[PDB]
Structures are given as structure tokens and as C-alpha cells.
């Protein structure tokens, strides 16, 4: 379900990608010429010299990994690169503060957007009927029936693999007698209402809410 | 953070070098802050985002119809479709199918996967 | 019956007028009531038991002067006995009565302890009448006063007075 | 052990740089980036999810006891009490005291409120004007402007008390806090003028002086309900925090028991975060809990029990149980507190602002032969040109000045700048160009397209001069990706929901950015240059 | 049985608190070194074992 939620919001992550792109290019053009030397943090591993390198540095900052030492190393006064025929900008505050405040925001925006898209599942009593029970019924139905070949086909009550949750006082017989059987079980096992007229009520509810074969659904 | 917690515990007096563990009580200032701005107020923050998203989502509450679980139930009128399993026909091709489709096979193969990882 | 040229206005208040917690609310409403109806409302203070009304030696001549001033062309009557419509509705004077009530029974004692503890023991006697005022249905509670601040209830009192004028 | 150190995202980048040195820069980044993304961000999203699910179950199960109804009843009661005390106080004014019936209206008047807000701002500016070695005139300015503001704030303390009822003025929580802060100011005057004042005094007294900035943020109502709920449920916040404190005490006593005095290595005493005594053990356990140098505090914990061996290096169990079941309990505590008090304190808002509004409502050129055709092929060609332009500026070479690739990218920039001027010319046929109601300007995205294109062209114009001005005009051409926001009907929805989120969140951001100002000012008081070292 | 009727549970909780405070003051010196305070805390510790074993028997 989380994979589905992630794949159902391809644009909340696109925003994070756009932010990484923007800040990678900005850091490229401003801090690109700092001198690569160790004992600092703009070194042979961290630098804004190529786009992959800058994106790695920004991923390092986003996970909060001594980003302040990079920030202090990109402050002005640093020797410039030799391939450049001094360098270092004081923008390095606004570049590294804001980034951390932006990513850490857009991350949360992403996470919650994925949580709450999915919030139907995360809060769930696991007792009242849910997709798990319906799919378990689908597989047992396939166990007692080959591919799409069940119309009545029933002379047995061996359908007790339906656990206590949806023969107590033969209410199983009442439910069975009173895809069509799937929808009948859906309506009855919920036991929403009991008035003796709920078949026509189900008819009108399905008509108003709905799109498919309703000539068999109510019976 | 801890590189600064210990420059500010050694902190002595205006324009004077450090003294080892001059004041450990200063750590309180760095604890309260950490509890307030980093822990409490940036979890108030995600809590606020969560509750706001839930409000943005309950706009389509639609209380005229009943609770949400029956909404998923009625949306699952699209179930009860066939699933391919290829029940065997040949007798030489059914014994193997049965033995490989029994749980006796899957337990063993979980055991072998674990042994290969080991 | 027939209107005595105007509807006499008395204010029941949250409780008995003999204790400051209530009569202060009456004065507070009366000041603002009088300062916006010049030539439209005459305020008078009555003391005798006008509950015993016909339409006691002191009470003998008390009732008629209210009608006399009502004919003068609405009129505010300030009493010390009308603490419920029942002790005033037995006779059909056809008045309009301002029905002050507090929506909660729990702020009353907090108001009681406010200024001084000398009055404290009367809180029950304070509260019972409010309880005895609580269950009265709106049709005999014609003036509905629910809210907190004066500045809006004073505007609320404006509207009731223009059914005829 | 190394992978688990990476997952917690501290020490992640070392073990990547060491591997980069060992086996080259090429592949290892896949391993470690994927490890962080799958195993750190994703399984933190899952944890936030499961916790929020449990908390939304507990909220609904909290509709059995109806604690929210208790909070609402208390809120209405405390509103009504002051509302009726207004009736009483306005009654008392019928030893002539004609002054009060005017000074009360002055109090309620917005001019006085804005005056006492401007005074708060001056107080802040006299506090924030701290400085390492400020000129000697600034010190006397701050002293006199502190005395004057304290005297005035006491003046509008007593004026507010006497224009209302004392027994009514103390009803409001805010005024009870304000009386406290001005009393703290008076105590400050006493201590500083008697000269018996101590560094703890210069801390707490100036601290309460800062707290007077809370005189702002009293209109704002969502945070008012939030604070009301926090003060309602303090019996549970205290319990949760106290249980956390006991967990930390246990994991610090065990810390001293296992690593007490075992950190003495002949190397220079760089081990500041030892486990020696109890206060220095609490700081170390807290540092592990927040996970700052969890590595080093575990490598020292290991190398104390012999090097990496079998009996030794089972002292990773301590620093792993700690980092697991301390961050879990931190997240649980500080999300239960921050959701069960921020979803009920938003119910207050949704049930009283609604109620109050319901209460008040119930009381009451050429325009011929154009070509806007084929807007379904431009709407994709422009995307597949913006993407290539974005990659184009992603492919520049900073370190070399006259790079071979840079000339080719300049040629691409020529082509793309011309093509992106083509659509600007095209949309003349569409209504706009400050003509026809100015339909051009009503939608800022088209203007932004023109703006970034115009900058890419102004850089060209300056390039003939070839001067360092373009040094900025180059950088801003990073704006090119944002054009997609206009051209992707899906991306527009997300980038608008983000702004809606910002506006809805704004109160919390304001509280936090105003509550960091107090900590900045206290830090300035405490460490105003006491951090040097030779 | 009637001992637990009496509210001593407060005194046993105060014993727990005194044990926490006895553990806080104990400085773990590197190699068997000790000061006077660590010497006294061991006698106080025998006291705490006594007061815990007694209540163990009772409960
Ligand atoms: C925004 C999304 C951007 C996606 C970027 C994906 C890039 C894939 C190819 C990158 C590549 O070529 O890897 C090698 C790179 C640099 O190689 P290097 O040897 O150090 O350069 C000096 C040559 N004399 O070495 C690297 O460090 C690449 C690191 C890339 C990290 C990407 C993180 C994505 C989040
Ligand atoms: C054996 C593995 C047991 C579970 C390990 C879970 C590790 C947590 C996920 C990775 C991580 O990023 O941890 C750091 C996280 C705080 O990280 P951050 O918010 O960036 O600061 O801190 C956390 O999220 C702690 C999460 C604790 C989960 C406990 C699960 C029940 C035990
Ligand atoms: C005002 O920010 C602060 O004082 C903070 C500062 C600067 N340092 C740290 C790291 C904090 C922080 O977590 O930054 C957050 C990161 C996520 C986005 N957050 C809001 C935001 C959204 C979009 C654009 C910009 C900002 C800012 C506090 C803080 C704690 C808790 C809540 C909070 N808040 O802004 O609500 C802020
Ligand atoms: C001789 C005593 C000097 C130290 C007194 C206390 C200073 C250190 C207190 C550390 C508190 C940290 C709290 C950890 C999280 C609750
Ligand atoms: C000299 C050795 C070259 C080996 C090249 C391997 C490339 C990929 C290795 C890392 C892939 C890890 C994926 C993690 C699971 C998604
Ligand atoms: C509430 C607004 C605060 C603005 C004033 C504080 C910032 C400037 C004061 C310190 C500047 C020192 C520069 C050297
Ligand atoms: C929870 C697992 C982490 C720690 C497990 C303990 C492993 C101890 C042995 C590892 C090293 C053995 C000796 C290597 C040669 C120096
Ligand atoms: C409830 C109060 C507990 C305070 C401490 C209790 C135990 C203290 C015993 C030893 C105190 C240290 C001094 C040792 C003699 C010089
Ligand atoms: Ca970290
Ligand atoms: Ca670090």
C-alpha cells in the first residue's frame, strides 16, 4: 500500500527533484571554483564541480551531515581553483540555511502526502469487513470454482472457511439463501440495517450511487 | 552540536580563554533549546501538517451516505473475477503440480533460501 | 385585551434583585437602554408589590400610575418583586419583559465570590431562583438574553421596541 | 554494524568516502545512496505512518470519555466569566470616579493597544541590540531605555488592573503572565540597583524580559486554542516527559556502570563526551539520543573493552538498544503530545469560530486572422525543450573557464533562447501584451516566461560588453526549470497545494521564529564573547 | 497482610528515590581508585539491600 501511495503521487516527489536540481545548479555556478584540498570540506569527494558531485553534496546536506562545515568552507576568502585562470562567496549562508529549511519541509510535505493518501489503511480496526476478507473469499471461491464458471453450482455448506468474522443459529443459511453472491454477502454480513425491505433499499442505493449488470445484483 | 556544547561549558568570561569544565550547568541552556525547537516544536509541526491534511481530505466527507468502510465495500463490486491456475489434465503433469503447489514444498524452499543466505 | 398605550418593561434578571450580583446587571442594562431612546422611553423605579395587581394599603394606588405614565406615549418599570413571569403574568397587563438569564449554573457562584465573602452564604438562595428561572419555556420568556458582553446585548434590546414604533 | 551506522544517517558519508578512495568514485554511490533512501527515509516514512495511525485510533477511542467536551465546557465557562464581569464592571461606574468610564474605553481602543505593541517592539530592539563590544554609549542607551520601558509597562500594568477588576483582570491567563513578567522586571530593578545580582540573575531576569515579546501573538486564535489545550493536558505532558527522563536516567546509570573511567586512552584527551560522572553521563546519553557522534561515542566504548573482538565489541548492544528505543520513545512522546493536543485544539477552533459566526448570522494593433491553432503540439514541444535546456545548464563546466564543452553549450543556448523567444512572439495573437484587458498580466506565469527569456537575452546583450555583470545574470538563468510549472497541469496543482500548506502552517512558523529569538538573545547574554580561545 | 494496609508504599518509594540518588553520587573511578564517598555508599548500599530484602519477605 505504501508503494501504491508513492506511485500515485509522482508530482510531490517531482517538486523535491526540482529543488535538488535548482540548488545543484546554483551551487555549481557560485561555489564551483573553490580549491579542492583536504583538511577542508570542499575536497576530492565533496565539491560543486560536476552536477553529480553537487547533487551528492546536497544529498549529504539534506541528511544533515556536517553541512555547517561545508558552509564554513564555502564562505569567502578561499583560494580559487587552478583550472580557473579570491573565490568563495558569502551567499554560502543563504544557500545552505535555506536549502536545509526547504528540503526538510518538502520532505515532510512528501511524507504526509503519502501517509494520508493512504490513511484509509493506516487506521483500521481489522475487525469489520475489509479488502483482506473479500480477497480471502475470492481465493476460496476460486478454490470451489474454476475461472468464471459459478452460477449456482452450490449444494454444500462446506463454506465454513469463512471464520467467525465475516453455523451460528443457522444465520449462515439465512445469509446464503437470502459475483452476485459476493455483493449479497457484502450487504448482509455488514448487517447495517434490518427492516425486511433492504433489498429494494439496496436497489435504489446502488442505482443512485453508481454502471454494470444490475439485473442480477438485487436478487 | 557537542563541539559547541563544550566550547560553551569551558566558557569563562568576556574576552578570556577557556577553563576545562568551568560551568556544566550551561548544558541546561543547550538541553531546553534542543527539547523545544528541535524536538517539541518540529513535531508540533508534523502534527499540524497531518491534521491540516486530514481536514483538507475530509471536505469530501459526504455524510448523506454512510461510513467509509461501506464506501470501499461498494467500490469492490468489481471483485469476483476469474483467476488463472491451470488445473492439470495430464496424469504425469498433475503429480508434480500437486507436490510443487503444496506447502510442504514452500516451507522447504524457504529453508533453502535461508541456507543460501547463511 | 388592549395595550395600555405601551408595554411596561421590567427585567427579571438572573436572580433576586435584593442582592447586588443581579441588580448591578439591571443598572448596567438600564443606563445603555436610556441613553439611546430619548423621547421614546421614560424610566421609573417602583418598589411596592405590583404582583398583587387588578385589571396592601400602600399597594392600593400603586398599579394605576404605571398605566397613567404608559398612556403618556416605550416605558421602563424598575421593580423589586417581579423575579419570574408567573408572579407577574397572573394579570393580563400585556407588557414586554426583559428576561435576563445565564446559560450556565456554574459561573454564578464564581460571580458570587467576586467582590466579597460577606454575601457568599446567599449563593444557594441566589442560584435556586435562576434554577427556578432556568426551565421557563421561551414563549413566556419573550426577550431572549444569552450572550456575554453588554455592547451587543444592548443592540439586541433595540429591536424588540419597534414592533409598533 | 557499518550498515546500521549508515542507516541512522550519521557517519554515512565517511564509510562512503573511504570506499570511494578504495575502489573509485564510480559505483559505490549507488550502494550508499540507495541504502539511505530505502533504509532511512522510507522506513522513517513508514514509522511516521504507523504512529499516526495509532494516534488516530486513539483520538477516536477518546470520544468515549469525551475529554474534548470537557475542554470545550471549560473554555466556554472561562469566556463567560469574563464576559459577565464586563457587565458588572460597566455597572459599577453608575469620591467621583468619572475617569474609569473613559479609561476603560481607552484600554479597549485600538490606539492604546498599538501603542503597547510598539512599546514591546522598542523593548525587543533594546534587548536585541546586544553586541560583543558595543560602544559605551550603547550600554547607557540600553540601560535607560530598559528602565523607561519597565516603568511604562508597570504603568499600563496598574492602569489595566484598575480600569478593570483585579479579580477579573487575573482571570485571563495572558494577563496573569503579564503581571508575572512585569513583577520580574521590578525584581530585576531591585537586584541590579542593590548590586547583589548574579549570572543566574542576568540569565533569568533578562529571559523574562524577552518573554514580554509574547504580548504579540494574542489575536491569533488557532495558537490560542493550542495553548489552551496544552495547559489543559499538562498532567499528561508532565507524565510523558517524566517517563522519558527515567528512561534517560537508567541508560545513564548503566552508562556509568559500563564505561565509567574506561575512556582513558593515552591519546590526547579529545574525549570530551565521556561517561565519568553523572552530569557528564547525562550529556553523553543525550548526545547519543539525538544521534550526533553516536559513532565516536561507540568506537570509544568499544576500544575500551579491547579492540574489535568477540567478547569486546558486544558493547554495540548498548549503543544500539539506546539509539533504537530512545529515538522510538522520543518520537512517540513528542508525537502523542503534538497530535493529541493539536487535533483537539483545532477542534476548539472548528467548533467555536463556526459557532460564533453562526451566532452573529442568526442574530442578523491587430485582432484579425490569428493563429491559436495547434496548442496541443506546442504544449509538448515546449516541455521537451525546457527539459533539454535544463540538462543543458546542468552540463556546464565550472572549474575550467574556456572549456571545450562550454562553447557547444553556448551554441545550444543560442538555439534555445531563439526558440523560447518564438513562443513569446507567438502569444501576441493570444490576448495580452497589455492589450485587451491585459489578459497577459492577469496570469503571472506567462510574464515569468517572458522574464526568464528576457534575462537570458539581456545576458547576451551584456556579453558584447563582456563584463562581470553577467556574473549574476548567468546564475539567475537557473530559472529555466520553473517554466514547467506553467506547462504541466499536474505540477501546478502540487505547487499550489504547497502554498496553501504554507499559509495554513504560518502561525506555527511565526511562533517558532519568534521563540528562537528568545534563545538567540539568551545565548547572546550568556556567551557574549566568552567563546574565544588561543 | 495488614502491613500493606498501612501506607508505607510511600516509604518504599522514598527508598527507591534514595537508591537513585545513592547511584547518582557514585563516581566510577578508572582502575579501582576510590574516594571517601564511594566508601560510604557501599555501607549505605548494604542498608538498601536490607530494606529491600525485608519488604521482599513481607510481600
Ligand atoms: C537530481 C537527480 C540527479 C541524478 C544524478 C545521476 C547521475 C548518474 C551518473 C553520475 C556519474 O557519472 O557518476 C560519477 C561521479 C563523478 O565522477 P568523478 O570520478 O569523481 O569525476 C572526476 C573525473 N576526473 O561520482 C558521483 O559521485 C555521482 C554521485 C551521484 C549522486 C546522485 C544522488 C541522487 C539523489
Ligand atoms: C534492527 C532495526 C530496528 C529498527 C531500526 C529503525 C531505524 C530508524 C530508521 C532510520 C533512521 O533514520 O533513524 C533515525 C530516526 C531519526 O532521524 P531524523 O528524524 O533524520 O533525525 O530515528 C527513528 O526514526 C527511530 C525509529 C525507531 C523505530 C523502532 C521500531 C520498533 C523497535
Ligand atoms: C522558523 O523556523 C525556525 O525557527 C527553525 C529553524 C530556522 N531551525 C530549524 C531546523 C527548525 C526547522 O525545523 O526548520 C523547519 C524545517 C521544515 C520547514 N520548516 C518550516 C518552513 C517551511 C517552508 C519554508 C521555510 C520554513 C522549517 C526550526 C523550526 C522548528 C519547528 C517548526 C518550525 N516551523 O517553521 O514551523 C521551525
Ligand atoms: C556538581 C554538579 C554540577 C552539574 C550540575 C548539573 C549540570 C548538568 C545537568 C545536565 C542535565 C541534562 C538533562 C538531560 C535530559 C533530561
Ligand atoms: C569492480 C567491480 C564492479 C562491480 C559493478 C557493480 C555495479 C553495481 C553494484 C552495486 C549495486 C547495488 C544495488 C543495491 C540494491 C538495489
Ligand atoms: C527585531 C529586529 C532586530 C533588528 C536589529 C538587530 C540586528 C542588528 C543589531 C546587531 C548588528 C551588529 C552588526 C555588527
Ligand atoms: C548486533 C551485532 C553487532 C555486534 C556483534 C558482535 C560480533 C563480535 C565479533 C566480530 C568480530 C570478530 C573478530 C574479528 C577479527 C578482529
Ligand atoms: C533523600 C536524600 C538523599 C541524599 C543522599 C542519601 C545518601 C547520602 C549518603 C552519603 C553522602 C555523601 C557523604 C559521605 C560522607 C562524607
Ligand atoms: Ca543527524
Ligand atoms: Ca556530525
Numbering used by the authors:
A (entry chain D): 1400 to 1484, 1494 to 1574, 1582 to 1593, 1607 to 1638, 1647 to 1655
B (entry chain D): 1137 to 1254
C (entry chain C): 222 to 276, 297 to 314, 316 to 407
D (entry chain D): 354 to 447, 509 to 778, 889 to 943, 964 to 1078
E (entry chain D): 119 to 177
Show sentences the authors wrote.
The benidipine molecule penetrates into the DIII−DIV fenestration and corresponds to a ‘claw’ shape density in the map. The main moiety of dihydropyridine is biased towards DIII. To understand the molecular basis of how benidipine is recognized by CaV3.1, we compared the benidipine-bound CaV1.2 structure with that of CaV3.1, and the result illustrates that most of the residues participating in benidipine binding are also conserved in CaV3.1, such as V1053S5III, F1129DIIIP1, and F1513S6IV. Although I1046S5III, M1178S6III, F1181S6III, and M1509S6IV in CaV1.2 are substituted by L1386S5III, V1505S6III, M1508S6III, and L1813S6IV in CaV3.1, respectively, we speculate that these substitutions by similar residues are tolerable and that the relatively conserved binding pocket underlies the basis for how benidipine acts as an inhibitor in multiple voltage gated calcium channels. Although benidipine does not inhibit mutations T1056Y, Q1060M, and Q1060F as potently as it does in WT CaV1.2, it still retains the ability to block the current.
The voltage-gated calcium channel CaV1.2 is essential for cardiac and vessel smooth muscle contractility and brain function.
